[PDB]
Scaffold this active site. Structure first.
Site, mmCIF file in Angstrom:
data_model
loop_
_atom_site.group_PDB
_atom_site.id
_atom_site.type_symbol
_atom_site.label_atom_id
_atom_site.label_comp_id
_atom_site.label_asym_id
_atom_site.label_seq_id
_atom_site.Cartn_x
_atom_site.Cartn_y
_atom_site.Cartn_z
ATOM 1 N N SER A 11 -30.614 4.200 25.909
ATOM 2 C CA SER A 11 -30.424 3.698 24.548
ATOM 3 C C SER A 11 -31.095 4.472 23.346
ATOM 4 O O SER A 11 -32.497 4.414 23.559
ATOM 5 C CB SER A 11 -31.050 2.081 24.736
ATOM 6 O OG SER A 11 -30.804 1.545 23.159
ATOM 7 N N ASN A 53 -19.635 1.099 22.729
ATOM 8 C CA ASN A 53 -19.901 1.910 21.663
ATOM 9 C C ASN A 53 -19.654 3.278 22.014
ATOM 10 O O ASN A 53 -18.918 4.067 21.419
ATOM 11 C CB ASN A 53 -21.182 1.536 20.630
ATOM 12 C CG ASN A 53 -20.921 0.231 19.819
ATOM 13 O OD1 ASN A 53 -20.076 -0.489 19.675
ATOM 14 N ND2 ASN A 53 -22.028 -0.065 19.290
ATOM 15 N N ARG A 54 -20.386 3.664 22.999
ATOM 16 C CA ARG A 54 -20.214 5.047 23.455
ATOM 17 C C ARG A 54 -18.666 5.573 23.961
ATOM 18 O O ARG A 54 -18.343 6.954 23.696
ATOM 19 C CB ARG A 54 -21.131 5.548 24.487
ATOM 20 C CG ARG A 54 -20.809 4.971 25.946
ATOM 21 C CD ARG A 54 -22.112 5.058 26.912
ATOM 22 N NE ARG A 54 -21.992 5.277 28.237
ATOM 23 C CZ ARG A 54 -22.687 4.702 29.090
ATOM 24 N NH1 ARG A 54 -23.633 4.024 28.868
ATOM 25 N NH2 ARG A 54 -22.387 5.044 30.444
ATOM 26 N N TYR A 84 -25.544 9.089 30.457
ATOM 27 C CA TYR A 84 -26.330 7.974 30.194
ATOM 28 C C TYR A 84 -26.766 7.172 31.501
ATOM 29 O O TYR A 84 -26.979 6.137 31.517
ATOM 30 C CB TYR A 84 -25.482 6.988 29.562
ATOM 31 C CG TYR A 84 -25.158 7.049 28.097
ATOM 32 C CD1 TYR A 84 -25.899 7.288 26.902
ATOM 33 C CD2 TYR A 84 -23.768 7.878 27.916
ATOM 34 C CE1 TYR A 84 -25.562 7.574 25.776
ATOM 35 C CE2 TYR A 84 -23.427 8.174 26.699
ATOM 36 C CZ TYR A 84 -24.152 8.272 25.555
ATOM 37 O OH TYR A 84 -23.680 8.660 24.325
ATOM 38 N N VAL A 168 -30.647 -4.176 24.120
ATOM 39 C CA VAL A 168 -31.487 -3.473 23.698
ATOM 40 C C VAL A 168 -31.899 -2.602 22.641
ATOM 41 O O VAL A 168 -30.685 -2.288 22.032
ATOM 42 C CB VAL A 168 -32.183 -2.380 24.898
ATOM 43 C CG1 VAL A 168 -32.450 -3.395 26.270
ATOM 44 C CG2 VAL A 168 -30.906 -1.568 25.423
ATOM 45 N N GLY A 180 -33.104 -4.746 18.115
ATOM 46 C CA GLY A 180 -32.795 -3.505 17.287
ATOM 47 C C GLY A 180 -34.208 -3.042 16.499
ATOM 48 O O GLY A 180 -34.951 -3.708 16.214
ATOM 49 N N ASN A 181 -34.077 -1.541 16.471
ATOM 50 C CA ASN A 181 -34.976 -1.011 15.959
ATOM 51 C C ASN A 181 -35.173 -1.294 14.543
ATOM 52 O O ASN A 181 -36.182 -1.403 13.709
ATOM 53 C CB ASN A 181 -34.721 0.456 15.866
ATOM 54 C CG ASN A 181 -35.506 1.291 14.982
ATOM 55 O OD1 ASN A 181 -36.951 1.530 15.322
ATOM 56 N ND2 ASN A 181 -34.863 1.839 14.098
ATOM 57 N N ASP A 182 -34.027 -1.673 13.906
ATOM 58 C CA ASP A 182 -33.763 -2.051 12.478
ATOM 59 C C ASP A 182 -34.068 -3.610 12.183
ATOM 60 O O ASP A 182 -33.989 -4.120 11.407
ATOM 61 C CB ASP A 182 -32.355 -1.680 12.075
ATOM 62 C CG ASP A 182 -31.353 -2.607 12.793
ATOM 63 O OD1 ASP A 182 -31.901 -3.365 13.877
ATOM 64 O OD2 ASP A 182 -30.052 -2.404 12.637
HETATM 65 N N1 LIG Z 1 -28.748 -2.448 14.843
HETATM 66 C C1 LIG Z 1 -29.128 -1.941 16.118
HETATM 67 C C2 LIG Z 1 -28.437 -1.749 17.202
HETATM 68 C C3 LIG Z 1 -29.009 -1.628 18.706
HETATM 69 C C4 LIG Z 1 -27.828 -1.569 19.790
HETATM 70 O O1 LIG Z 1 -26.738 -1.164 19.276
HETATM 71 N N2 LIG Z 1 -28.239 -1.601 20.899
HETATM 72 C C5 LIG Z 1 -27.171 -1.215 22.087
HETATM 73 C C6 LIG Z 1 -28.060 -0.172 23.065
HETATM 74 S S1 LIG Z 1 -28.522 1.158 22.204
HETATM 75 C C7 LIG Z 1 -26.971 -2.696 22.645
HETATM 76 O O2 LIG Z 1 -28.175 -3.565 22.963
HETATM 77 N N3 LIG Z 1 -25.610 -3.090 22.804
HETATM 78 C C8 LIG Z 1 -25.369 -4.405 23.197
HETATM 79 C C9 LIG Z 1 -24.516 -4.978 22.082
HETATM 80 O O3 LIG Z 1 -24.128 -4.615 21.216
HETATM 81 O O4 LIG Z 1 -24.445 -6.568 22.340
HETATM 82 C C10 LIG Z 1 -30.497 -1.077 15.940
HETATM 83 O O5 LIG Z 1 -30.426 -0.610 14.726
HETATM 84 O O6 LIG Z 1 -31.234 -0.877 16.870
HETATM 85 N N1 LIG Z 2 -26.355 -4.946 11.899
HETATM 86 C C1 LIG Z 2 -25.287 -5.397 11.186
HETATM 87 C C2 LIG Z 2 -24.055 -5.740 11.938
HETATM 88 C C3 LIG Z 2 -22.718 -5.910 11.050
HETATM 89 C C4 LIG Z 2 -21.725 -6.531 11.951
HETATM 90 O O1 LIG Z 2 -22.235 -7.058 13.077
HETATM 91 N N2 LIG Z 2 -20.497 -6.635 11.626
HETATM 92 C C5 LIG Z 2 -19.347 -7.285 12.243
HETATM 93 C C6 LIG Z 2 -18.596 -8.020 11.267
HETATM 94 S S1 LIG Z 2 -19.732 -9.508 10.493
HETATM 95 C C7 LIG Z 2 -18.487 -5.993 12.503
HETATM 96 O O2 LIG Z 2 -18.155 -5.045 11.695
HETATM 97 N N3 LIG Z 2 -18.163 -5.936 13.866
HETATM 98 C C8 LIG Z 2 -17.742 -4.472 14.429
HETATM 99 C C9 LIG Z 2 -18.269 -3.809 15.213
HETATM 100 O O3 LIG Z 2 -19.427 -4.304 15.970
HETATM 101 O O4 LIG Z 2 -18.033 -2.721 15.844
HETATM 102 C C10 LIG Z 2 -25.780 -5.969 9.547
HETATM 103 O O5 LIG Z 2 -27.041 -6.420 9.911
HETATM 104 O O6 LIG Z 2 -25.032 -6.120 8.740
HETATM 105 O O1 LIG Z 3 -24.279 1.163 27.051
HETATM 106 C C1 LIG Z 3 -23.834 0.901 26.089
HETATM 107 O O2 LIG Z 3 -23.444 -0.206 25.713
HETATM 108 C C2 LIG Z 3 -24.003 1.915 24.947
HETATM 109 O O3 LIG Z 3 -23.186 2.073 24.114
HETATM 110 C C3 LIG Z 3 -25.281 2.557 24.946
HETATM 111 C C4 LIG Z 3 -25.232 3.722 24.197
HETATM 112 C C5 LIG Z 3 -25.251 3.982 22.670
HETATM 113 C C6 LIG Z 3 -25.254 2.967 21.995
HETATM 114 C C7 LIG Z 3 -25.297 3.116 20.617
HETATM 115 C C8 LIG Z 3 -25.254 4.408 20.050
HETATM 116 C C9 LIG Z 3 -24.856 5.532 20.864
HETATM 117 C C10 LIG Z 3 -25.181 5.419 22.043
HETATM 118 O O4 LIG Z 3 -25.117 6.315 22.963
#
Ligand SMILES: N[C@@H](CCC(=O)N[C@@H](CS)C(=O)NCC(=O)O)C(=O)O
Ligand SMILES: N[C@@H](CCC(=O)N[C@@H](CS)C(=O)NCC(=O)O)C(=O)O
Ligand SMILES: O=C(O)C(=O)/C=C\c1ccccc1O
Ligand SMILES: O=C(O)C(=O)/C=C\c1ccccc1O
EC number: 5.99.1.4
Lengths: 203, 203
Positions: A11, A53-54, A84, A168, A180-182
């Site tokens: 991640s 997402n990847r 990964y 994570v 989230g780091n954010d």
């Molecule tokens: N908004 C994030 C997102 C973190 C995130 O996308 N984590 C991935 C792994 S890098 C994850 O846990 N995906 C599971 C999910 O979306 O439910 C942050 O800035 O850290």
């Molecule tokens: N980290 C976010 C996430 C925003 C989000 O989850 N948006 C949804 C709709 S409320 C979305 O665009 N989902 C599409 C996706 O996860 O790719 C924030 O704090 O606004």
């Molecule tokens: O295994 C997953 O679900 C995943 O997408 C992890 C990889 C990742 C997440 C968000 C941005 C880039 C990225 O490579």
């Protein structure tokens, strides 16, 4: 003060969260309990089985920009590795003993994989990491393939799922969880509150 | 200064982003170009077809806490409506004329749906919103069912997909795009930079 930190070396958001947490640990002496877990298993456990997402090019194009933005904010490099495949290095975390050695492991492996873009399944990475940490390369590589190592990994991922971890990086402080780091700013605010109450500045 | 804002009234993160953006518009006179789009269509377009966050109970339990955290930070209520059926109200946005009336529409509908938890498909919501904005209820309801209204909605969602929008809330400033209410700090920093350069404080 103790934060539980859940991560998977695959991640990049975990790489960022780990850099920020490590600086809290070094600058303020915050105590981190580290947990390497299987993001794949935790997703499957909650029914999150669509494309990752990847695998979604338009979204990944954006997330790569987001990741460079945070890397610039934190003053660190961020370079995508070729795959990964984080299982071996995740398992290797459970070789680490004390807090200092667990943190050093996590920082060295994150910096190698996401700082330098080294494939996490590179066959020589266990030896490279062993050299850095002053470990016994052969003992470390033997541990990586051991039944016990996989069991320890499986155990921790299970414990995370029981705790309602779904992704994570995830951080707990008391009964509060942030993903989230954010979200580290929220953890930092919670930490300040607890510092003030313990200093009797606040009830 | 102009920000393009893309949203879907079904999104609670969009509700939060809209409150924060509106306060920039009122406090600093930032110009917002509003776009109501079909989040469903934009996801399908990029192949994001797994279960939605709304359908993943463990993740949704957390996101509800995250949403209350931000609501508290912003000093606003956030109450889940009974469904996410936002199509009619999304379409209704395209009745609005000027900036001030488009912003008033978006703020009234967001506050009704996510501030008060009113179902976005409530049959009387068009009339309630018409009263608030001083619109002709019947003209508004006729527009909502018109072929032209759906065409305008379809057009804007298409334009968003062309612009590589994959989710909401999404904000553009120049060539930079950010997705998420939790990225507005980056937009705010970009805005400060541009203000300083235009004031000749910075090259
Ligand atoms: N908004 C994030 C997102 C973190 C995130 O996308 N984590 C991935 C792994 S890098 C994850 O846990 N995906 C599971 C999910 O979306 O439910 C942050 O800035 O850290
Ligand atoms: N980290 C976010 C996430 C925003 C989000 O989850 N948006 C949804 C709709 S409320 C979305 O665009 N989902 C599409 C996706 O996860 O790719 C924030 O704090 O606004
Ligand atoms: O295994 C997953 O679900 C995943 O997408 C992890 C990889 C990742 C997440 C968000 C941005 C880039 C990225 O490579
Ligand atoms: O349509 C979707 O994909 C979706 O999950 C929108 C709803 C949502 C998102 C995030 C948190 C809560 C919530 O209801």
């Amino acid at each position: 003060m103790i934060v539980d930190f859940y991560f998977d070396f695959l991640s990049p958001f975990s790489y960022l969260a780990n850099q920020r947490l490590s600086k809290l640990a070094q600058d303020y002496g915050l105590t981190i309990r580290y947990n390497a877990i299987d993001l794949a298993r935790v997703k499957i456990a909650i029914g999150n089985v669509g494309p990752s997402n990847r695998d979604l090019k338009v979204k990944l194009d954006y997330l790569k920009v987001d990741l460079q933005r945070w890397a610039q904010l934190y003053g660190i490099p961020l370079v995508f590795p070729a795959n990964y495949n984080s299982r071996r290095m995740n398992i290797g975390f459970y070789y680490s003993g004390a807090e200092a050695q667990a943190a050093a492991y996590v920082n060295v492996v994150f910096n190698a994989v996401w700082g330098e873009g080294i494939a996490p399944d590179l066959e020589s990475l266990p030896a490279l990491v062993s050299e850095k940490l002053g470990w016994d390369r052969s003992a470390f590589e033997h541990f990586l393939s051991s039944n016990a190592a996989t069991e320890r990994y499986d155990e921790q991922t299970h414990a995370a799922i029981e705790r309602k971890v779904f992704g994570v990086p995830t951080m707990f402080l008391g009964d509060e969880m942030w993903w989230g780091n954010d979200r580290l700013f929220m953890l930092e605010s919670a930490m300040g509150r607890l510092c003030r109450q313990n200093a009797d500045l606040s009830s």
